[PDB]
Amino acid sequence: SDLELHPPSYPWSHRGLLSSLDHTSIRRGFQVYKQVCSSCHSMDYVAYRHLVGVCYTEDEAKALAEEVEVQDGPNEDGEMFMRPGKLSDYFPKPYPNPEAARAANNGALPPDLSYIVRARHGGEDYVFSLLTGYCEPPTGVSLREGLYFNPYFPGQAIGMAPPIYNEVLEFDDGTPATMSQVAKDVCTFLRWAAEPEHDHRKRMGLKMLLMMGLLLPLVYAMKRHKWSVLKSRKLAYRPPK
Amino acid sequence: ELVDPLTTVREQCEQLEKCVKARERLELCDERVSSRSQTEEDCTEELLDFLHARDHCVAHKLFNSLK
Amino acid sequence: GRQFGHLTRVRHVITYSLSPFEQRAFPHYFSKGIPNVLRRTRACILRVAPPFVAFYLVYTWGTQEFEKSKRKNPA
Amino acid sequence: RHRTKKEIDQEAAVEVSQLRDPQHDLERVKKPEWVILIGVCTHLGCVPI
Amino acid sequence: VAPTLTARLYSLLFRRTSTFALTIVVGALFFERAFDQGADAIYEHINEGKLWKHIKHKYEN
Amino acid sequence: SHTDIKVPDFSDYRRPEVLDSTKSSKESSEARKGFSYLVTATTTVGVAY
Amino acid sequence: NIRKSHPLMKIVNNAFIDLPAPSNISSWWNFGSLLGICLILQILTGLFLAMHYTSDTTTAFSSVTHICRDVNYGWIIRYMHANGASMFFICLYMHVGRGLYYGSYTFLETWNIGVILLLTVMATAFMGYVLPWGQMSFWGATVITNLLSAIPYIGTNLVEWIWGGFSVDKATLTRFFAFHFILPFIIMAIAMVHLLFLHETGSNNPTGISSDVDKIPFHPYYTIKDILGALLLILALMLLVLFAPDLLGDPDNYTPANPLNTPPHIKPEWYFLFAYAILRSIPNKLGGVLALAFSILILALIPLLHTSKQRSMMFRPLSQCLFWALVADLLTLTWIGGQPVEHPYITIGQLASVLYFLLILVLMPTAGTIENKLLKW
Amino acid sequence: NIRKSHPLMKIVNNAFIDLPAPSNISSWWNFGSLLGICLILQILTGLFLAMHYTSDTTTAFSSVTHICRDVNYGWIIRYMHANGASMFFICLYMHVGRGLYYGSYTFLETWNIGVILLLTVMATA
Numbered sequence A: 001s002d003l004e005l006h007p008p009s010y011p012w013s014h015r016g017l018l019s020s021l022d023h024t025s026i027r028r029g030f031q032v033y034k035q036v037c038s039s040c041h042s043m044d045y046v047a048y049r050h051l052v053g054v055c056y057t058e059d060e061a062k063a064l065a066e067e068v069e070v071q072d073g074p075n076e077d078g079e080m081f082m083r084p085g086k087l088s089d090y091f092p093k094p095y096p097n098p099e100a101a102r103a104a105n106n107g108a109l110p111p112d113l114s115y116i117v118r119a120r121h122g123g124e125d126y127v128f129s130l131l132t133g134y135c136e137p138p139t140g141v142s143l144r145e146g147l148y149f150n151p152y153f154p155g156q157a158i159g160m161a162p163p164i165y166n167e168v169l170e171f172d173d174g175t176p177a178t179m180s181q182v183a184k185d186v187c188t189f190l191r192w193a194a195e196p197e198h199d200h201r202k203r204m205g206l207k208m209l210l211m212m213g214l215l216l217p218l219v220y221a222m223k224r225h226k227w228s229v230l231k232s233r234k235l236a237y238r239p240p241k
Numbered sequence B: 001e002l003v004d005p006l007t008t009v010r011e012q013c014e015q016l017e018k019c020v021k022a023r024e025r026l027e028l029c030d031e032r033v034s035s036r037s038q039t040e041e042d043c044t045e046e047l048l049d050f051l052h053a054r055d056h057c058v059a060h061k062l063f064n065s066l067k
Numbered sequence C: 001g002r003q004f005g006h007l008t009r010v011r012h013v014i015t016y017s018l019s020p021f022e023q024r025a026f027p028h029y030f031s032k033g034i035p036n037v038l039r040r041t042r043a044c045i046l047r048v049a050p051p052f053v054a055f056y057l058v059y060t061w062g063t064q065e066f067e068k069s070k071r072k073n074p075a
Numbered sequence D: 001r002h003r004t005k006k007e008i009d010q011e012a013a014v015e016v017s018q019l020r021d022p023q024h025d026l027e028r029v030k031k032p033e034w035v036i037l038i039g040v041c042t043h044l045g046c047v048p049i
Numbered sequence E: 001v002a003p004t005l006t007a008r009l010y011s012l013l014f015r016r017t018s019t020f021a022l023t024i025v026v027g028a029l030f031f032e033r034a035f036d037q038g039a040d041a042i043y044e045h046i047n048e049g050k051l052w053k054h055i056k057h058k059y060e061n
Numbered sequence F: 001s002h003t004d005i006k007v008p009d010f011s012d013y014r015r016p017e018v019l020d021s022t023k024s025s026k027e028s029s030e031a032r033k034g035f036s037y038l039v040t041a042t043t044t045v046g047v048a049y
Numbered sequence G: 001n002i003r004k005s006h007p008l009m010k011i012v013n014n015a016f017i018d019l020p021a022p023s024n025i026s027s028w029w030n031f032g033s034l035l036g037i038c039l040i041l042q043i044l045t046g047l048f049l050a051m052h053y054t055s056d057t058t059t060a061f062s063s064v065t066h067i068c069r070d071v072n073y074g075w076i077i078r079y080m081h082a083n084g085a086s087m088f089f090i091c092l093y094m095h096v097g098r099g100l101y102y103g104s105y106t107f108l109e110t111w112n113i114g115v116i117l118l119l120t121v122m123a124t125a126f127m128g129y130v131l132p133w134g135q136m137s138f139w140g141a142t143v144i145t146n147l148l149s150a151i152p153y154i155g156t157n158l159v160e161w162i163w164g165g166f167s168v169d170k171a172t173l174t175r176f177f178a179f180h181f182i183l184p185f186i187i188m189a190i191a192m193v194h195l196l197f198l199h200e201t202g203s204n205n206p207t208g209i210s211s212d213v214d215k216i217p218f219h220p221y222y223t224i225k226d227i228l229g230a231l232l233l234i235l236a237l238m239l240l241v242l243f244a245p246d247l248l249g250d251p252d253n254y255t256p257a258n259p260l261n262t263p264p265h266i267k268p269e270w271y272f273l274f275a276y277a278i279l280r281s282i283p284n285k286l287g288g289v290l291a292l293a294f295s296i297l298i299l300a301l302i303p304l305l306h307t308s309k310q311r312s313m314m315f316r317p318l319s320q321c322l323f324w325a326l327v328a329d330l331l332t333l334t335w336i337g338g339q340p341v342e343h344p345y346i347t348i349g350q351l352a353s354v355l356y357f358l359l360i361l362v363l364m365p366t367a368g369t370i371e372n373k374l375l376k377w
Numbered sequence H: 001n002i003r004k005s006h007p008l009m010k011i012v013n014n015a016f017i018d019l020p021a022p023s024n025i026s027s028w029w030n031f032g033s034l035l036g037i038c039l040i041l042q043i044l045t046g047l048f049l050a051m052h053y054t055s056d057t058t059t060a061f062s063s064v065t066h067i068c069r070d071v072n073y074g075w076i077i078r079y080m081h082a083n084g085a086s087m088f089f090i091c092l093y094m095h096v097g098r099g100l101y102y103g104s105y106t107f108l109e110t111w112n113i114g115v116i117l118l119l120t121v122m123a124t125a
């Protein structure tokens, strides 16, 4: 029941109606999630195979899956065991359940991020503004220990410490890992995570507009063609006198 | 040690007339309640207005520097 | 149901019609079309517009009040 | 909810004539310092904050 | 007094319903190639160097 | 009295190839039919696609 | 001629080909067939979703996810089904508004079962929105089902009997999926009785005057206009599917259902917001529920409120203005319904709520009596 | 007389009330309506099973178990639906045999779609 400040609209390169995602920024954004976010945030609905042909090759994505160990089994003795990930595995969860998560994060629950952009008003505008929007509390607000001031979060008191900062990681293509850079890349990746169909739907949308621009006047012309018999008909009344 | 395109834009954003006025109204509220602490009158409202006008002008030209 | 030949009674009415392949499907589409649209909107605007302007004024006032009703006062 | 003494005497020093479902704090709880409810609104089932 | 293209199209293709339908199905076949060819060419020229089709050459090996 | 009848003028709706009342309509019958049936053919193409 | 004597093609002939229809019915008469198309789309997209959806709380949220990510072209099927439902309600509300403005309600049998067709679609889309099992799905399902607890004496029994428990849980999601599957076929059956009673008389037209003196066959004139209209219906749907799929959907529904806390502000889909506003306009439980029921069941008693010696409003300016004050008033109640119960939206919601019932029950009946006396009859 | 002029009750009248029928049709002509009843039973028992059944391999076996043990009177609903399907096929085979012995197949349209009604029931069960 506090005052709200809504995020402005940043000019993402995928904002326009026909504008695709930038897949190099996705690639960088996955690197942010893996190294920084995945230790607190799950992504229960994304698997390594989804990366293939979007931002990594099959060989690259396979090598990426094998960099972590996942549980499998039972074997012939009835025991569970660990093996390296394969393309079919979903991204490892950091905690077995949310109760462990609250205990590891001063009682707060980092939500799953698979859909985070779609489950909050403002999408990447909100997330970009949140990550890059931390500041000292205004005069008269004193937050309990464990909590951090962030003016874009409802109530302005969030249980997540600022998770990104200059040089948290180095990008593979040499791009300077500035806070704003890291925010932009991770936000583009999170859009893709929530809406992998983004680019394909816009390509279809273009084809739908072009076909409609053809079919609407042609079907209109067929309507007018048949109806012209009636629209130009003339009547006369000739009663006997 | 390492620069930041985020911080440079914000310092040249707070210069336009619409942003300094919000700075003056919260700097008053910085000294109004802290005249002597006792009240319950926080000062969150005058800060969110300053961030509204500020973060509007950053989004315009921030992305011109990134890849 | 109802059939042609059992509808009603008509007498002394002549209808002239032209084939659709002998005439144009878009004749004077803009020449006569736009002035007719102006007449049609002119004839009905006073019956439709006022209630939706009335809605517009309530809509802006109600949000304007609510958007600032939760602002703080010095008291 | 563990009720304090600032709250017992607020809900004890209340008139019950105008209540919609009138009943003193005795009938409600078992002991004056304990209120054990169930979190559903009696209107249409939302949980109150 | 050679008949225009529209008249020669009617005499040869449209008068018979069968030939009228044959050229619809054939018209669909050749329209499909050139429409998806040209349409995809626009969608990516707008988004040049933005998606995997373009940056595929970097990570070949 | 039915000889007093005259069909009214349709020149406001006739196509260009027809307004000459002294020129045969068969000279343009194939071009006019072809144009309207070409509209239909390209329509079913798009629905087919 | 076999088209007129084959017992099967006879019924098709008398309904789509040689059916006499008025020569002057406008685009507002296109929405009857667009409702049929909308229904067909919701059958087909609905059916192909039901081949990949699972009906239990543990994986109901995940099976919808599984469609939008893993099955070929299931995301487009799913948004067609979601936005198809909203297009269904656009067409429903134009269909009804056409009937009121032009007086088509005098077809009592056709009209009174039309009301039934409205209720069953609402009941369908209600039990459809529960299935993805998001937050809005769960608590929207909670608010609605508890409306029956307001019935005196037997209230709680009907709710817990509907629930199959003590709250909306696994047992409800399973039966609601069963109901959501079967109801759209009942709808199609009643829509066929809708037409059967309609053909008894034929269509009304913009003037309210009998068109027997000037009818045209339905084919080719209205077959092509219904095609053109449908092509504009596909356009409306595909713009929503392919350029704005989450414009009408609420973000909160993208978080799995949590039976322990609500969102700070819940809002139905747009097509129910006007009625939710009427519910909240009363500080009484049973009062709010009854005002909600009569908000829709008011349609059943429109024909009893017809006072004009003319049928359509085309020649009734004073009724036109009151008609558009109802659309604006309904557009007002939609706005309140999407806003939190706070000042001044509360008092606005009550004034617009009275104006709704005041127009239908008082102002429009007497407005027709005036204009009868202005015309000396 | 309203039974003969109401557009809805007209179709009921001409099918179940005033419909002329032969005076000598035996019990082998009873199976047409028993097929309709069987269908209605399979709709209703089927529908009330679908309110408690889940459609995935992990718990599909268990949800049927859940019906026969936990839901009130679901075991009887389930055996009605299972045995109702078998009664459906008894009636189907008598229906066809009646048609062959007494030559009813000369109604080509009725018969040829009857074949279609046989295939779709098999596909259902």
Ligand SMILES: CCCCCCCCCCCCCCCCCC(=O)OC[C@H](COP(=O)(O)OCCN)OC(=O)CCCCCCCCCCCCC
Pocket (backbone or CB within 6 Å): C040, C044, C048, G028, G093, G094, G096, G097, G098, G100, G101, G206, G271, G274, G313, G314, G315, G327, G330, G331, G334
């Ligand atoms: C219960 C559900 C509530 C849900 C809330 C929905 C939000 C409402 C948003 C408003 C959208 C309005 C659509 C645009 C209407 C424009 C109409 C116009 O341009 O022309 C007025 C026309 C007059 O034309 P005549 O027929 O008198 O004669 C013509 C002579 N040339 O007269 C006519 O054409 C009028 C025909 C009927 C119009 C249908 C719109 C009404 C929609 C809701 C009605 C529900 C009532 C219970």
Ligand SMILES: CCCCCCCCCCCCCC(=O)OC[C@H](COP(=O)(O)OCC[N+](C)(C)C)OC(=O)CCCCCCCCCCCCC
Pocket (backbone or CB within 6 Å): E014, E015, E016, E017, E018, E020, E021, E024, E025, F037, F040, F043, F044, F047, F048, G227, G230, G231, G234
């Ligand atoms: C197993 C794989 C098999 C695949 C087979 C592929 C075959 C493709 C279709 C070809 C058939 C063509 C038949 C044909 O055109 O006749 C149908 C009508 C006739 O048009 P019309 O111009 O009246 O008369 C033509 C007369 N002629 C031939 C002498 C010139 O033509 C038209 O009038 C049709 C125009 C309207 C089409 C739209 C109908 C779809 C429903 C609505 C769509 C939008 C919303 C759902």
Ligand code: HEC
Pocket (backbone or CB within 6 Å): A032, A033, A036, A037, A038, A039, A040, A041, A105, A108, A109, A110, A111, A116, A120, A127, A131, A153, A154, A157, A158, A159, A160, A161, A163, A164, A186
């Ligand atoms: C990659 C750098 C990260 C992004 C993007 C986000 N985080 Fe976190 N996070 C953490 C906790 C303990 C919470 C719960 C806070 C609370 O409920 O009060 C969160 C929550 C979020 C949210 C939700 C915001 C909202 O609900 O409106 C977002 C959008 C979010 N986080 C983004 C903890 C951690 C953490 C542990 C050290 C890390 C590394 C990250 N978060 C990383 C990211």
Ligand code: HEM
Pocket (backbone or CB within 6 Å): G028, G029, G030, G031, G032, G033, G035, G036, G092, G095, G096, G099, G104, G105, G107, G110, G111, G113, G114, G115, G117, G118, G121, G187, G191, G194, G198, G202, G203, G204, G205, G299
């Ligand atoms: C699934 C629901 C519905 C379907 C498929 C449907 C379909 C149709 C169709 C095809 C027509 C004839 C063509 C036309 O006028 O557009 C029609 C007419 C009519 N409908 Fe519906 N309708 C539905 C719901 C309703 C509702 C909700 C109402 C009113 C509350 C209603 C009342 C009427 C009336 C009065 C007519 C006669 C209109 C006239 O001929 O002037 N129907 N309907």
Ligand code: HEM
Pocket (backbone or CB within 6 Å): G038, G039, G042, G043, G045, G046, G047, G049, G050, G053, G064, G078, G081, G082, G084, G085, G088, G121, G124, G125, G128, G129, G130, G131, G132, G180, G181, G184, G185, G187
């Ligand atoms: C008039 C007919 C129908 C309407 C208005 C309708 C409406 C809806 C709506 C609004 C949703 C919510 C979608 C979402 O929030 O994601 C939904 C979901 C669903 N519907 Fe329907 N529906 C109709 C018919 C059907 C039919 C006939 C079937 C199956 C045979 C079906 C199957 C489903 C399924 C499986 C879902 C859950 C998947 C999902 O949420 O997308 N629907 N429906």
Ligand code: HEM
Pocket (backbone or CB within 6 Å): H028, H029, H030, H031, H032, H033, H035, H036, H092, H095, H096, H099, H104, H105, H107, H110, H111, H113, H114, H115, H117, H118, H121
């Ligand atoms: C769901 C499937 C079916 C239903 C509900 C059904 C129902 C009926 C009914 C009620 C009758 C009239 C009363 C009677 O003779 O018993 C009838 C007659 C008939 N049926 Fe069926 N039937 C079905 C399947 C079939 C099949 C599988 C066949 C043939 C392969 C068939 C062929 C016929 C014929 C030829 C008649 C005329 C019998 C006569 O009047 O002498 N039907 N059916």
Ligand code: HEM
Pocket (backbone or CB within 6 Å): H038, H039, H042, H043, H045, H046, H047, H049, H050, H053, H064, H078, H081, H082, H084, H085, H088, H121, H124, H125
């Ligand atoms: C002519 C119509 C039908 C026939 C012949 C039929 C037949 C059958 C049969 C033989 C089974 C196997 C039962 C078992 O082995 O336990 C079955 C299962 C089932 N049927 Fe149907 N059925 C029909 C209609 C329906 C309908 C309309 C529904 C739902 C709306 C339905 C829902 C189910 C369900 C949920 C099961 C699985 C539960 C179970 O195995 O008992 N059935 N059906």
Ligand SMILES: CSC1=N[C@@](C)(c2ccccc2)C(=O)N1Nc1ccccc1
Pocket (backbone or CB within 6 Å): G122, G123, G125, G126, G127, G129, G130, G136, G137, G138, G139, G140, G141, G142, G143, G144, G266, G267, G268, G269, G270, G272
């Ligand atoms: C079951 S959640 C639900 N179903 C819808 C689609 C519906 C409700 C009633 C009738 C038809 C459709 C709707 O708007 N909501 N949301 C919602 C939110 C808050 C309160 C009530 C419903």
Ligand code: FES
Pocket (backbone or CB within 6 Å): D041, D042, D043, D044, D045, D046
């Ligand atoms: S007040 Fe209506 S649900 Fe709590």
Ligand SMILES: [Cl-]
Pocket (backbone or CB within 6 Å): G061, G064, G065, G132, G253, G254
């Ligand atoms: Cl989802």
Ligand SMILES: [Cl-]
Pocket (backbone or CB within 6 Å): H061, H064, H065
């Ligand atoms: Cl079993």
